[model samples]
Target: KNNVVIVATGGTIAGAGASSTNSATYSAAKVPVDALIKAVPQVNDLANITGIQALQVASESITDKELLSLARQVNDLVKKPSVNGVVITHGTDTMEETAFFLNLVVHTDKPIVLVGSMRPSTALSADGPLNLYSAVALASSNEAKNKGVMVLMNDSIFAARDVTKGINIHTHAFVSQWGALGTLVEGKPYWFRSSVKKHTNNSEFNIEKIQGDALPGVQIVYGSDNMMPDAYQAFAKAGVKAIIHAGTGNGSMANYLVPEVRKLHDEQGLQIVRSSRVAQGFVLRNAEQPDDKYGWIAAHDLNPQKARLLMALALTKTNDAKEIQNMFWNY
Candidate 1:
């Protein structure tokens, strides 16, 4: 039997609602590792699965420290000679963010799959069992290794960096806007295409060198109507090394906000990254804001949340904006 680790972190999938329809009215952390495993007996056929209760808090309540812990844990396990792969049971909310964090920090050659369900385990149409089953299969299967972090939801497998939960409440709520790299059919991983980024076996940020130090402080400045300098000021005053502006279309900030952002970039020595609010298309510099000559980098495809995580991790090694931009673009 191949040993594959399944780390369970609390989320809505582990929650219990008074009724299925009341997604908002629910108690989190009702399910434990053994109980969840027993609920899905079919997993016995997949691999020798061992469950670990990693976190008991809601995903929204999860902190950056917790993310560092998770990444380090997975890094340690991937180095074990006997282990095949690892599976993570995470909360739906903030699941993508944590997955992206792991993607940037822990570069593993083995499959590390993140799984969650939109419906609570107590619901009539609970999808947790099947989701967990597929996750284990993906984790244990030879086909899933070296695929980077994969999210198993509604039978479709997605790369963590590109996934976003779409619907509010549904079994297939989890979505990859670029779609899945593959699908699980009858316990088998069938290929369609690949969407993994920044993770190559040849890359340097693998599990072997992933340290547990606190990642660099990076802040996200959202574009809004005359937003005060409070967010920017707080980050700067507290010593943030990088700032990613979750800008409007094409990663261009409003005319009024440009000077404040420039001050943060130029005077404060903070690295500026401009990412788009819109989902599709690249955010190119020069064309969007030709006068952005103040040395702000544009986040090509990464959304705001993921961009912030990447920037924080990227700053741990280097502070050069051009090098960081190249890393972001290449990764």
Candidate 2:
């Protein structure tokens, strides 16, 4: 059997509720890794299972430090000849962020799949057991190797670059605008597509280099009509090195916010990245705004949360917007 390690960063998959019906009203990070594995007996049949509780917190509470920590640990784990792949149990709220972060940083050909449940482990028909089983199966599958980090939920497998938690109350909550790369049934994986985006073994990033240091401070500012410049000012004081404008539509900033953004770009030396708040569509560099003129970058297909991670990680290597813009397209 292939050796697969499940690193648990507690979320709903490890969550507990007073009553089975209280799925949405529960405390997360209440269960341990061994218990999670025990609940899914078939997981061991799919792989030689090892469970490690890396962190116990809601995903929203997970910060840059944890992201770096997990990447570094997974980097070490995948290097073992005995280990074939790795699975991460995370909260659905920020599962996509962690997956994308790992996708870009961890330099590995081994499969790394992230899984989470919409309903808590204590809920009726809780989705955690089967999702956990499939995650282990995908981690051990030969077809999943070198395909980049993925998020498995609702029987669908999504590339890390293409996924997001689009819904809050359903098992079929993980979504990708580009569609799933494949699906999993009864611990078996079937594939129909592969992500061409740069990631994993093909990525230029190496987790070891950045593991000991904290990621650069990057903040996201949501755009709206009559948007104020105060948030930009506040972030500047907070030592934010870059700002991702989660703009209204097509990554467009209001005319009122443009001057402040320009000042932040020119004076404060902040990297201004344009990303859309919409659920679909990619952002073009010069279409909604002239990114070239302001030394700004577009987020391409990345959502604001994922864009912030790419920017923070990119800032670790370079300060040039042009280089990061290239990263947006290539990754």
Q: After superposition, how far is residue 230 of candidate 2 from its true place, in Å?
A: 0.6
Off by over 4 Å in 1: 20-22, 206-213
Candidate 1 RMSD to the real structure: 2.0
lDDT, candidates in the order shown: 0.78, 0.88
lDDT score at residue 54, model 2, on the 0-100 scale: 88
Stretch of 10 with least lDDT, candidate 2? 17-26
Per-residue alpha-carbon lDDT of candidate 2 for residues 110-142, written as tens digits (9 for 90 to 100): 999999988878778888888898888889998
Report the lDDT tens digits of candidate 1 across residue range 1-331.
5788888888756555455654444456778777778888788789998888887778788877888787778877878887888988888878899877777667568888999877777767777788899888888898787777888898888888788777786677777667788899788899888764666453445434646556778888887656676788789999999878888788877777678778887898988888977877778866677534677777888888888888887777677777777777766
| Residue 176's lDDT in candidate 2 | 90
Candidate 1 has which clashing residue pairs, if any? none
Give per-model TM-scores. Answer: 0.93, 0.97
Scored by TM-score, the top model is: 2
Off by over 4 Å in 2: none
